[PDB]
Design a protein around this ligand. Structure first.
Ligand code: ATP
Ligand code: ADP
Ligand code: ADP
Ligand code: ADP
Ligand code: ADP
Ligand code: MG
Ligand code: MG
Lengths: 116, 243, 397, 38, 391, 278, 58, 235
C-alpha cells in the first residue's frame, strides 16, 4: 500500500508506525540537475530553438518544485502562442520563469530587518 | 372520492422531449413521462412534481418546497403599518422609498435613466431607532412578499446549516418575486473576515460568503431590494460593505 | 452448551534450519494430512444412510413449506402462541405448531417461521449472522510466546487473566478472589499489544473472537447493539471463550450528550456492550481483552474496577527487552560475525518492537542492495536511520 | 422609549382611575421612563 | 551511489547458490500441507443444523393443518390515544413497530373495557381490528428487575458510611418500623430520597443492605436496561412492579443508576407514571422510593419538588476508619494472615473509592497466587495497593 | 435501458436560460485579465490545435484574486456567457454540508459531472471558504472543511486526471489559500485583479456611462484623473448614484452637480480618526 | 427475439448471501432487506458448491 | 391510516402529506373533511388505499409539550405565600385585574400590560407566587426555567417556547412563566433574548395567555425586554 501527503508531521503516530508504514519516502524539491531533467522531460514535445540552454533555465529556479517546472514549460509555450509562433526562445523561458515563480515578498523593509 | 392521490418528487433531468428522470421523495427514482396537456417548458430540473400513483407520469408541477424556518419567517404578518406612524425620518425614509420602492413601481424610469435598479441598502443606527418599523412600512406600502429576518437567528451549531438557510431564504425570494429580504442585526453575520481560526467565527465567514454570493454573485438578482439593519455599522465586512 | 473452537496445526519450528528434521516433521504432517483426506474421501465414497423416517419428515416439511423465514423469538405467550420479530423488525403474534421443542423456545433463539401465515415451525440455535461468524478465529495465528521478546510481566499478567482461570482455577476460589473478568492492554503503538493477542490466541483452549471495535458499529438502526449482543451470545454459547476487541477507543471514547441519531446509536452500542459486559458473571468462563493506544481517551466507566479490573501497561522496550527483540527478529537472518547489534540498542531512542522489526527488514533490504545475504553491521548502521525518520542540542547535557 | 412614555402614561391613567389622560400624567410618565433609562 | 536493480540473472542466482539444499522439498511439502488443509476444510461438510423438531408421536399434524388453515396470525402494536371513544369512536391510533400507525376499531370478541392506551394488542391483517389485548407480562426471568426478596448484605457488610447509614436510617427505618411517631407528630413520612454520589461509593450496596435490614424486598432497576431494548412498555412494566409492591407487604423500590433514566418521550412517560405512583399513590405507603445517581442535578426538576422527594443524601468517599473497615469487610472473604495491618493499607490508599479497595484486595489475592502461596501476606497487599492505587 | 453516465447528478448545470447576459464588451478594461482567463478557459476549448502544435498542455485552472468589486465574478459571468463549454457554477460555502462526508461527496460529484460532460468549466466563487490554508484542525468541523479541501486537491490533480475540465476559482484573499492549491498543475495561473489604474478607470467609466444618458459636457476624464483607490464596483456605484440623484431632482440628463454629489457620497472614507494615530 | 421476450417477462431474482448450507436440501441465506430465509436448492445447483458467504440468486 | 399533513398548497387547496408509511403524497382534493383549520401538521386519518382525508383527529404531542405535563391546579389560596402582601396585590393588579376589566382597558383605547418583571435573591419564592397567581386566576400554568434554557443549545426559542405558546393558545386560559434571572461564545443568549422579544411581540395581542418573568437580580437588564409590553410590571 502506498500513501501520499504534504503534512506527514500531523499524521497519526499509530499510522506512521513502522510495520504499518515503512520506508517513509521523502520527495524533496528537485535540485539543479533534477530540475534540468524535469525541464528536458516536459519540453520534449515542444518545438525548441537551436541555442536553447535549459541548464540556465534550471539554474533560474532555486528551490522550485517539479510542478513549477512543468508550469514554466507551459507558460513559455503560452508566450510562444501569444505571438502566434511555434518556436520557444530562451527569453520566453526566462519570462515564464519570472511569471511562474513570482511570489509576494515582505513589502515592509522594517519588518524584514527585525532579524540580523 | 373518485380521486386517488399522487406521489410527489423532484425532476432530475430531461432525458428527451418526453422521458424525464424523476426522483420520488424518500424513495426510488424513475424515468417517467408527462401528461399530454402540460407546460414541459416549465419542468426544469429540481422542480417538485406530482406523479400518478399507478402509471407514474407527470401529473402536475408543484411550488418548490419551502423550509419550515423560511415558512415561519415568511408568514409573519407585517400588520399593514402605514407611513404616518414613523415620525421624523423624512429624508431617510424618502431615500429608502427611492432605493427600494422605485424599482418596484416604475422600473422603466430607472431603465430610461440608464442605470441598474439598486440591489438593496443598509439602515444603521442605535437600537430602538425604527429601522425595523421603517422597513416594515416599506413592505406594507409595497404590498409585496416580506421576509423578516434577524441575523442572530440563522446561525446554527450544525456546520453547514446557516449558509444553507441563507440559500433557502434567497431561493424563496427568487421564487416569490417581488420580495423584500429584511435581515436585521446583520453585524451578527457580516462581522468582518479574519483568519484567527476559531470554528464559530469561521463558520460565520462561510455564512457571510454565502450571503455575498446570493446577493451579488454569479446568479444576478431581478426584483429580488433587501433591507439590512444593524447597530454596529463599522464592524461590517468590507466586501459586504462594498457597493 | 457446546465447546470451544480455533483448531490450529502443529507448531513445528522445532528446527528452523531446514536440516531435514524440518523435513521429517513436515513429512509426518503431510502424510497424516493425506491420511485424513483418504479416510474422509473413502468414507463419503461408501456412506449409505438416508430416508428412514421420511414420510413423517416429509409431512412435517410439507407443513413447514418453503421458504421458512427465520425470526427472533422476542416473547412467549401461553404455550400455543408467541411473539416473534421478523428480521425486518416487525413482530407478530403467531401460533407455535405441535412439532416444535417447547424446551428450546427461549427469548432470543432464532425460530423458523412459515412464509405465509407466520407460525413457529422450528428453532435455529446456530443463526450466527455472517458478521459474528467472521469475527471468530478459525486458523490460529502462527505467532507464539516464543516469538514475543520481553514483556515478561505483560505475558505473566495476561496469562493470569485469560489462561489461569480456564486451566485449573482452584486457586481463585481457594483464595476467595473472583477471576478477572476482562483485561485491557494499553501503551504506545507497536509495543506488542496485538502481538500478545495473537500469542494468546495461539496457546489457547477457548473460543477466540477477534473484534476490530469499529466493526461493531453498523449503519442500520439497532444493528450495532444487536451485533454486540449476538457476539457475546456466541461467546457464552461457545464458552469458555475469549473476546478480543482491538482498538477499543474506536467506540470507548468519552460518553457525551448525543444529538445526532448516529451519535445516539454509537452511544447505544457502547451502552449495550457495557451492559453485556456486566451481564455475564466473572465466574463465567468468557473473558474480554481490549487493546488501545489512547488509554486516556477511554470512557471511565468501561475501565471501572467492577468491570475491567486489570490494566496491562506496555512501555516502550528497555535495553534488555530491545536486545531480546533483536535476537528474536534476527534469528532467521544469516548475520555476519562482525555485526554487534549493541550499537543500535545503545542509541537512546524510542525503538519499539515494530521499529526493531522494520530495522531488521531494512537491513536485509540493504544487504540485498549489495547483492549479499550475510548482512554486515554496516547494513544495520544505515538501516537504523533509514527507518527512523525525523531537545535543542545543548539544553539538557 | 417615546412609545413607552405614551403607553405607561396610559398605564398611569388607571392608577388614579381615569378614562383619559392629563398633562401631569404624561410628565410623570416620561419621568419614570427616564429613570428606567438611567 | 546509483544502486542497480537486481537483474533476472541476479534474481536467478539469489534463488540458488545461497540456499539450503532442502529449500525445494521443504517449501513444496509445506505448500501441499496448506493445500490439504484447504481440501479437508472444503470437503469436511457442515452437518445438519438440527432445526427444532420435537420427538415423534408428539405431533398433531392434522390439527396443525386445522390451525394453519383456520387460526390466523395477528400483528402486535403499541396502542395509543383512545380518540375519546365513548362507544361511538371505538377507533384508536395503533403503532405496529417500524410499520405505520392506523386508526382501527375493535373486534366483537373484545370489549372496550379490556382495551386502554399503551398496551400491546394483537391486530388482524384484513382490517387491523384489535383482536386480543396482549399484556407485556411480568416475569423475573425477563427484563432485569428486583430479582431479590431478601438481599444477602446486612449492615455488617457496609462500612465507612456511618453518618451516611445513619441518615438512611432516619429516612427508612423510622417511618417503616415506627409509623406511630409520625402519626402522633402529624408529619408525612419522607416521600422521596436521592442518594447522589460518585460511582463505586456504595450507594447501590448501602441501599441493598438497608433493604435487607428493613424487612422489605430490594428492587433493582437498571436504567440502561429500559433505555435500551426494553423501552416503551417500560411504563407499564414499572406500573406492574409498583402494583406488586402494593400486593407485597413492603418493597424497597430503588432504581439503580438512575443517571440513565433521569437524563425523554417514553422516559417522560415513565417518570410521569411514577408521578402517578408517588403523587397519585398515597404518600403513606411502605413502598418508599430510593433515588441514586452518579449525576445529582441530572434528575428532572419536577421530580425533587417538595411532596415528591423529601431528602437528598450525599455518599462521599470513605475516610480512614471507613477505608480500614471496608478493607476488613472485603478481606474476611479472603485467605490472608491474621496480622494484616489494615490501618496501614487504608492510610496508603487516600481518596480511594470502595471499588478501588475491593480491586486492591483482589489484586492482593492475585499476587498471592502469583507466588503460588495459599495465604496472602502484608507484602502482597502492599504491592497490590502500589499497583491499583497510584494507577 | 442504460442512461447517460451522470444523468441523476445532484448538482445542476447551467441551462441556456440560466446563462448570464454579461458579455466581454461590458467588462471595461482588464485586457490582460481577459486574455489570461481566455487562454486557459476559452482558447483551449476552441483552438486545441494551437496548443497541440506547440506541444504544451493548456493551463487548466485559473485563480482570480484581488480586492473586492474588481470584476472577478463578472469575468466568470462573461466566460459563462461566451462559452460553448459545460459550465458548472458553485460557491465555496455551498460545498460545506451539514452531514459528515457530504461535502467531499459533493466535490466528487461536481467534478465527476464535469468529467462525464463535454469540455467543461467549473467555477467556484469565494474559494477561501473551503480552501483556507491547512492547519492542525482540533475539531470535527475543521477536519471536515480540510477534508473538503483535500478532496478538491485530489480531484483537480489526483491519480486519475481530468481532460478538458478547466476550473475557475475566485477569492478576495489569495494569500490565505493552501499552497497545495496554489501550485502549477492545479491553479496554473493566479490572475491578479487590482483596483483600476487611471486608464482602467477611464475604460470602466466609459463602458458604464455608455447606456447612461448624456452627461452634458462633464469632466469624466477629470473624475477619472482624480487619484482615488476605487474599484470597478465603486465606479458602477458612482454612476448609479448619479442616476438616482437625477431621478430625485427630476432631470434625466446628469451633470457635474448631482454627479459630484454622487461621487462624494460613494467614496466617503470619512476618517473619523483621532489625530494621535496620524 | 421471442425467447428474449419470454425471459424478460419473468421476475428478477433476489440476490442473497448464504449464511450456511444447513442441509443437503436447505440453505440458510440472508437477502437484503427482506431478512434471512432458509431456502431450498433446485435441481441444477449442487449443494457442495454453495459455500458460506457467497452470492446466490433466489 | 394516520398521516402528518406536511403543508397545504393553493391551486382550491391541495395538501401534501407524509403518511406514517414514510411516504409523501399529493392530494388534489382534501378528502371528506373541511379544509379551513387544517394546520400544517394536523394529524389526519388518510385512506389506506386511495389516500384521501376521511377525518381529522386531535394532535398527538409536540415533544416537550408532552415532556411538560402542564399543571392546571397549583393549589395555593394566597394563604401559602406570606410576607409579599404589597407584591401579591401588585401581582393581582398586574395580571388578573387587567384581565377581568379588559373592557375598561379598551375604553381607555390602550392595550393591557403583557408581562411582569420580578426579581429577588435566589431563594425568594418567585416560583410559588407564580403558582399562587395561576391558582387564584384558575388558569392553566406554563413554566420555563432560565438555568434550564442556558444549556440545551439551539432550540430554546426555535421549537420549545413558540410551541409552548401554541399549546397555550390551544388550552386557554394559561400563564407563561420564565423563572430565574437567566442571562437576560455568548451569541446563543443573543438568540434567546431575540426570540423572546420578537415572539412575545410576534403573538396574539389580546394576551389571553399571560407571561410572568421571575428573575434573580436587577443587574443584568435588557432594555428591549424591560420595556413596555415585554415586561411592564416590576415586582
Ligand atoms: N516484545 C516484542 N518482541 C518481538 N516482536 C515484537 C515485540 N513487540 C512488538 N513486536 C513486533 O511488532 C510488530 C507490530 O506490533 P503489534 O502489532 O503488536 O503492535 P501494537 O503494539 O499492538 O500496536 P497497535 O495496536 O497500536 O498497532 C509485531 O509484528 C512484532 O513482530
Ligand atoms: N420614528 C420612530 N423611530 C423609532 N422607533 C419608533 C418610531 N416610531 C415608532 N417607533 C417604535 O419602534 C418600535 C419598533 O422597534 P424599532 O425601533 O422599529 O426597531 P429598531 O430597534 O431596529 O429600530 C415600535 O414599537 C414603535 O413603537
Ligand atoms: N461503605 C462500604 N462498605 C462496604 N463495601 C463497599 C462500601 N462502599 C463501596 N463498597 C464496595 O464497592 C463495590 C461496588 O459498590 P457499588 O454499590 O457498585 O457502588 P455504587 O454506589 O456506585 O453503585 C462493592 O462490591 C462494595 O464491596
Ligand atoms: N471592469 C468593469 N467594468 C464595468 N463594471 C465593473 C467592472 N468591474 C466591476 N464592475 C462593477 O462591479 C461589479 C463586479 O463585482 P465583482 O468584482 O464580480 O465582485 P467580486 O470581486 O466580489 O467577485 C459589477 O456589478 C459591475 O457593475
Ligand atoms: N415567602 C415565601 N413563601 C414560600 N416559599 C418561599 C418564600 N420565599 C422563598 N421561598 C422558596 O424559594 C424557592 C423559589 O426559588 P426561586 O427564587 O424561584 O429560584 P429561581 O430564582 O432560580 O427561579 C421556592 O422553593 C420556595 O419554596
Ligand atoms: Mg497493535
Ligand atoms: Mg464576487
Amino acid at each position: 500500500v502506498i500513501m501520499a501527503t504534504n503534512r506527514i508531521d500531523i499524521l497519526d503516530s499509530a499510522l506512521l508506525r513502522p510495520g504499518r508504514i515503512d520506508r517513509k519516502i521523502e520527495f524533496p524539491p528537485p535540485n539543479e540537475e533534477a530540475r534540468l531533467d524535469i525541464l528536458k522531460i516536459h519540453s520534449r514535445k515542444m518545438n525548441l530553438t537551436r541555442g536553447i540552454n535549459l541548464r540556465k533555465i534550471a539554474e533560474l529556479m532555486p528551490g522550485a518544485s517539479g510542478a513549477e517546472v512543468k508550469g514554466v514549460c507551459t507558460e513559455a509555450g503560452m508566450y510562444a502562442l501569444r505571438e502566434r509562433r511555434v518556436h520557444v526562445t530562451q527569453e520566453d523561458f526566462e519570462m515564464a520563469v519570472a511569471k511562474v515563480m513570482q511570489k509576494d515578498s515582505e513589502k515592509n523593509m522594517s519588518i524584514k530587518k527585525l532579524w540580523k | 372520492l373518485q380521486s386517488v392521490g399522487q406521489i410527489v418528487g423532484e425532476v432530475l433531468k430531461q432525458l428527451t422531449e418526453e422521458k424525464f428522470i424523476v426522483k420520488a421523495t424518500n424513495g426510488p427514482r424513475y424515468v417517467v413521462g408527462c401528461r399530454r396537456q402540460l407546460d414541459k417548458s416549465k419542468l426544469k430540473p429540481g422542480t417538485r412534481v406530482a406523479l400518478d400513483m399507478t402509471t407514474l407520469t407527470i401529473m402536475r408541477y408543484l411550488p418548490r418546497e419551502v423550509d419550515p424556518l423560511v415558512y415561519n419567517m415568511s408568514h409573519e404578518d407585517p400588520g399593514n403599518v402605514s407611513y404616518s406612524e414613523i415620525g421624523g425620518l423624512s429624508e431617510q425614509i424618502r431615500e429608502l422609498r427611492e432605493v427600494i420602492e422605485l424599482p418596484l413601481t416604475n422600473p422603466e424610469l430607472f431603465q430610461r435613466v440608464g442605470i441598474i435598479p439598486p440591489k438593496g441598502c443598509l439602515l444603521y443606527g442605535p437600537p430602538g431607532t425604527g429601522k425595523t418599523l421603517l422597513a416594515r412600512a416599506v413592505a406594507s406600502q409595497l404590498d409585496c412578499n416580506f421576509l423578516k429576518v434577524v441575523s442572530s437567528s440563522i446561525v446554527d451549531k450544525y456546520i453547514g446549516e446557516s449558509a444553507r438557510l441563507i440559500r433557502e431564504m434567497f431561493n424563496y425570494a427568487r421564487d416569490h418575486q417581488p420580495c423584500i429580504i429584511f435581515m436585521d442585526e446583520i453585524d451578527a453575520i457580516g462581522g468582518r473576515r479574519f483568519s484567527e481560526g476559531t470554528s464559530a467565527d469561521r463558520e460565520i465567514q462561510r455564512t457571510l460568503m454565502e450571503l455575498l454570493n446570493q446577493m451579488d454573485g454569479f446568479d444576478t438578482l431581478h426584483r429580488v431590494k433587501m433591507i439590512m439593519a444593524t447597530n454596529r455599522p463599522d464592524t461590517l465586512d468590507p466586501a459586504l460593505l462594498r457597493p | 452448551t457446546k465447546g470451544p473452537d480455533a483448531a490450529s496445526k502443529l507448531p513445528l519450528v522445532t528446527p528452523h534450519t531446514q536440516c531435514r528434521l524440518k523435513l521429517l516433521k513436515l513429512e509426518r504432517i503431510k502424510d497424516y494430512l493425506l491420511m485424513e483426506e483418504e479416510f474422509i474421501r473413502n468414507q463419503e465414497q461408501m456412506k449409505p444412510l438416508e430416508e428412514k423416517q421420511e414420510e413423517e419428515r416429509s409431512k412435517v416439511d410439507d407443513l413447514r413449506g418453503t421458504p421458512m423465514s427465520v425470526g427472533t423469538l422476542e416473547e412467549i405467550i401461553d404455550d400455543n402462541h408467541a411473539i416473534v420479530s421478523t428480521s425486518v423488525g416487525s413482530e407478530h403474534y403467531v401460533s407455535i405448531l405441535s412439532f416444535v421443542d417447547k424446551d428450546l423456545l427461549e427469548p432470543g433463539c432464532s425460530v423458523l417461521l412459515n412464509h405465509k401465515v407466520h407460525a413457529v415451525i422450528g428453532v435455529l440455535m446456530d443463526d450466527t449472522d455472517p458478521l459474528v461468524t467472521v469475527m471468530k478465529v478459525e486458523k490460529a495465528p502462527q505467532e507464539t510466546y516464543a516469538d514475543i521478546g520481553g514483556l515478561d510481566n505483560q505475558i505473566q499478567e495476561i496469562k493470569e487473566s485469560v489462561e489461569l482461570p480456564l486451566t485449573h482455577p482452584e486457586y481463585y476460589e481457594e483464595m476467595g478472589i473472583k477471576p478477572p473478568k476482562g483485561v485491557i492492554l494499553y501503551g504506545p503503538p507497536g509495543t506488542g499489544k496485538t502481538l500478545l493477542a495473537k500469542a494468546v490466541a495461539n496457546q489457547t483452549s477457548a473460543t477466540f473472537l477477534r473484534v476490530v471495535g469499529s466493526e461493531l458499529i453498523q449503519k442500520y438502526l439497532g444493528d450495532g447493539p444487536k451485533l454486540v449482543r449476538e457476539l457475546f451470545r456466541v461467546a457464552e454459547e461457545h464458552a469458555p471463550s475469549i473476546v478480543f476487541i482491538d482498538e477499543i477507543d474506536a467506540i470507548g471514547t468519552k460518553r457525551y450528550d448525543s444529538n445526532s441519531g448516529g451519535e445516539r446509536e454509537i452511544q447505544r452500542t457502547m451502552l449495550e456492550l457495557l451492559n453485556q459486559l456486566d451481564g455475564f458473571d466473572s465466574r463465567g468462563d468468557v473473558k474480554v481483552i481490549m487493546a488501545t493506544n489512547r488509554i486516556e481517551t477511554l470512557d471511565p466507566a468501561l475501565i471501572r474496577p467492577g468491570r475491567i479490573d486489570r490494566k496491562i501497561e506496555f512501555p516502550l522496550p528497555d535495553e534488555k527487552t530491545k536486545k531480546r527483540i533483536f535476537q528474536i527478529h534476527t534469528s532467521r537472518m544469516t548475520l555476519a560475525d562482525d555485526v554487534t547489534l549493541d550499537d543500535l540498542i545503545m542509541a537512546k531512542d524510542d525503538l519499539s518492537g515494530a521499529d526493531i522489526k522494520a530495522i531488521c527488514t531494512e537491513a536485509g533490504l540493504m544487504a540485498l542492495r549489495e547483492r549479499r545475504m550475510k548482512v554486515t553491521n554496516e547494513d544495520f548502521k544505515k538501516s537504523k536511520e533509514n527507518v527512523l525518520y525525523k531537545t535543542p542540542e545543548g539544553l539538557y547535557l | 422609549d417615546l412609545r413607552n412614555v405614551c403607553t405607561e402614561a396610559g398605564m398611569f391613567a388607571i392608577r388614579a382611575d381615569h378614562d383619559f389622560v392629563v398633562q401631569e400624567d404624561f410628565m410623570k410618565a416620561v419621568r419614570k421612563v427616564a429613570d428606567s433609562k438611567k | 551511489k546509483p544502486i542497480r536493480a537486481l537483474d533476472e540473472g541476479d534474481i536467478a542466482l539469489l534463488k540458488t547458490y545461497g540456499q539450503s539444499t532442502y529449500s525445494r522439498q521443504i517449501k513444496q511439502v509445506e505448500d501441499d500441507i496448506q493445500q490439504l488443509l484447504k481440501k479437508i476444510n472444503e470437503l469436511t461438510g457442515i452437518k445438519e443444523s438440527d432445526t427444532g423438531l420435537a420427538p415423534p408421536a408428539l405431533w398433531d399434524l392434522a390439527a396443525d393443518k386445522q390451525t394453519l388453515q383456520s387460526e390466523q396470525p395477528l400483528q402486535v402494536a403499541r396502542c395509543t390515544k383512545i380518540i375519546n371513544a365513548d362507544s361511538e369512536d371505538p377507533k384508536y391510533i395503533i403503532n405496529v413497530k417500524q410499520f405505520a400507525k392506523f386508526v382501527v376499531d375493535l373486534s366483537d370478541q373484545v370489549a372496550p373495557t379490556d382495551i386502554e392506551e399503551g398496551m400491546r394488542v394483537g391486530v388482524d391483517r384484513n382490517k387491523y381490528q384489535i383482536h386480543i389485548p396482549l399484556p407485556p407480562k411480568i416475569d423475573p426471568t425477563v427484563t432485569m428487575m428486583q430479582v431479590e426478596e431478601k438481599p444477602d448484605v446486612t449492615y455488617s457488610d457496609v462500612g465507612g458510611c456511618k453518618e451516611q447509614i445513619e441518615k438512611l436510617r432516619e429516612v427508612v427505618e423510622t417511618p417503616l418500623l415506627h409509623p406511630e411517631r409520625f402519626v402522633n407528630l402529624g408529619i408525612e413520612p419522607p416521600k422521596g430520597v436521592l442518594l447522589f454520589g460518585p460511582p463505586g461509593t456504595g450507594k447501590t450496596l448501602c441501599a441493598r443492605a438497608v433493604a435487607n435490614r428493613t424487612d422489605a424486598c430490594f428492587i433493582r432497576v437498571i436504567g440502561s436496561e429500559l433505555v435500551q431494548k426494553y423501552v416503551g412498555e417500560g411504563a407499564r412494566m414499572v406500573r406492574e412492579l409498583f402494583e406488586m409492591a402494593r400486593t407485597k407487604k413492603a418493597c424497597l423500590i430503588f432504581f439503580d443508576e438512575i443517571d440513565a433514566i433521569g437524563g425523554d418521550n417514553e422516559v417522560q412517560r415513565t417518570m410521569l407514571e411514577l408521578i402517578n405512583q408517588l403523587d397519585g399513590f398515597d404518600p403513606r405507603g411502605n413502598i418508599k422510593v430510593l433515588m441514586a445517581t452518579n449525576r445529582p442535578d441530572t434528575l428532572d426538576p419536577a421530580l425533587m419538588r417538595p411532596g415528591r422527594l423529601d431528602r437528598k443524601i450525599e455518599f462521599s468517599l470513605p475516610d480512614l476508619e471507613g477505608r480500614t473497615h471496608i478493607f476488613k469487610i472485603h478481606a474476611r472473604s479472603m485467605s490472608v494472615e491474621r496480622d494484616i495491618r489494615f490501618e496501614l493499607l487504608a492510610r496508603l490508599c487516600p481518596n480511594s473509592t470502595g471499588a478501588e479497595i475491593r480491586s486492591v484486595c483482589t489484586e492482593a489475592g492475585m499476587f498471592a497466587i502469583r507466588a503460588r502461596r495459599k495465604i496472602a501476606t502484608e507484602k502482597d497487599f502492599l504491592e497490590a495497593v502500589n499497583k491499583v492505587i497510584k494507577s | 435501458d442504460v442512461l447517460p453516465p451522470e444523468a441523476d447528478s445532484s448538482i445542476m448545470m447551467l441551462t441556456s436560460d440560466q446563462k448570464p447576459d454579461v458579455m466581454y464588451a461590458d467588462i471595461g478594461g482588464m485586457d490582460i485579465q481577459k486574455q489570461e482567463v481566455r487562454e486557459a478557459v476559452e482558447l483551449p476549448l476552441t483552438h486545441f490545435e494551437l496548443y497541440k502544435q506547440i506541444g504544451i498542455d493548456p493551463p487548466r485552472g485559473v485563480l482570480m484574486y484581488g480586492p473586492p468589486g474588481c470584476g472577478k465574478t463578472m469575468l466568470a459571468k462573461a466566460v459563462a456567457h461566451h462559452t460553448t463549454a459545460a459550465f458548472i457554477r458553485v460557491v465555496g460555502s455551498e460545498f460545506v454540508q451539514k452531514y459528515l462526508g457530504e461535502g467531499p461527496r459533493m466535490v466528487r460529484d461536481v467534478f465527476r459531472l464535469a468529467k462525464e460532460n463535454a469540455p467543461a468549466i467549473i467555477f467556484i466563487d469565494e474559494i477561501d471558504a473551503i480552501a483556507t490554508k491547512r492547519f492542525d484542525a482540533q475539531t470535527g468541523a475543521d477536519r471536515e472543511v480540510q477534508r473538503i479541501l483535500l478532496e478538491l486537491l485530489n480531484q483537480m490533480d489526483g491519480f486519475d486526471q481530468n481532460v478538458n475540465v478547466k476550473v475557475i476559482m475566485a477569492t478576495n484573499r489569495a494569500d490565505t489559500l493552501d499552497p497545495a492549491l496554489l501550485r502549477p498543475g492545479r491553479l496554473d495561473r493566479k490572475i491578479e485583479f487590482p483596483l483600476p489604474d487611471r486608464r482602467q478607470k477611464r475604460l470602466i467609466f466609459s463602458t458604464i456611462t455608455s447606456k447612461m444618458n448624456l452627461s452634458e459636457e462633464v469632466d469624466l476624464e477629470d473624475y477619472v484623473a482624480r487619484p482615488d483607490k476605487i474599484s470597478g464596483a465603486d465606479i458602477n456605484s458612482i454612476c448609479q448614484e448619479s442616476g438616482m440623484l437625477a431621478v430625485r431632482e427630476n432631470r434625466y440628463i446628469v451633470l457635474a452637480k448631482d454627479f459630484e454629489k454622487a461621487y462624494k457620497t460613494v467614496i466617503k472614507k470619512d476618517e473619523q480618526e483621532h489625530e494621535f494615530y496620524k | 427475439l421471442r425467447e428474449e421476450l419470454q425471459l424478460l417477462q419473468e421476475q428478477g431474482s433476489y440476490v442473497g448471501e448464504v449464511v450456511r448450507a444447513m442441509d443437503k436440501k436447505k440453505v440458510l441465506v440472508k437477502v437484503h432487506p427482506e431478512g434471512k430465509f432458509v431456502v431450498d436448492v433446485d435441481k441444477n445447483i449442487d449443494i457442495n458448491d454453495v459455500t458460506p458467504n457467497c452470492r446466490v440468486a433466489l | 391510516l394516520v398521516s402528518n399533513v406536511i403543508e397545504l398548497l393553493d391551486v382550491g387547496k391541495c395538501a401534501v402529506i407524509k403518511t406514517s408509511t414514510r411516504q409523501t403524497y399529493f392530494l388534489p382534493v382534501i378528502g371528506l373533511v373541511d379544509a379551513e383549520k387544517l394546520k400544517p401538521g394536523d394529524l389526519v386519518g388518510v385512506n389506506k388505499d386511495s389516500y384521501l382525508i376521511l377525518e381529522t383527529l386531535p394532535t398527538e404531542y409536540d415533544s416537550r409539550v408532552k415532556a411538560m405535563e402542564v399543571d392546571e391546579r397549583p393549589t395555593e389560596q394566597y394563604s401559602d405565600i406570606g410576607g409579599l402582601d404589597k407584591q401579591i396585590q401588585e401581582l393581582v393588579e398586574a395580571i388578573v385585574l387587567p384581565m377581568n376589566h379588559k373592557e375598561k382597558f379598551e375604553n381607555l383605547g390602550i392595550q393591557p400590560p403583557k408581562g411582569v418583571l420580578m426579581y429577588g435573591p435566589p431563594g425568594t419564592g418567585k416560583t410559588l407566587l407564580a403558582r399562587a397567581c395561576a391558582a387564584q386566576t384558575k388558569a392553566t400554568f406554563l413554566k420555563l426555567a432560565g438555568p434550564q434554557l442556558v444549556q440545551m443549545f439551539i432550540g430554546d426559542g426555535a421549537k420549545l417556547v413558540r410551541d409552548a405558546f401554541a399549546l397555550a393558545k390551544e388550552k386557554a386560559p394559561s400563564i407563561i412563566f420564565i423563572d430565574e434571572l437567566d442571562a437576560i461564545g455568548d451569541r446563543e443568549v443573543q438568540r434567546t433574548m431575540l426570540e423572546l422579544l420578537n415572539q412575545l411581540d410576534g403573538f396574539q395581542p389580546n394576551t389571553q395567555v399571560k407571561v410572568i418573568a421571575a428573575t434573580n437580580r436587577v443587574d443584568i437588564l435588557d432594555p428591549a425586554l424591560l420595556r413596555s409590553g415585554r415586561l411592564d410590571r416590576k415586582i
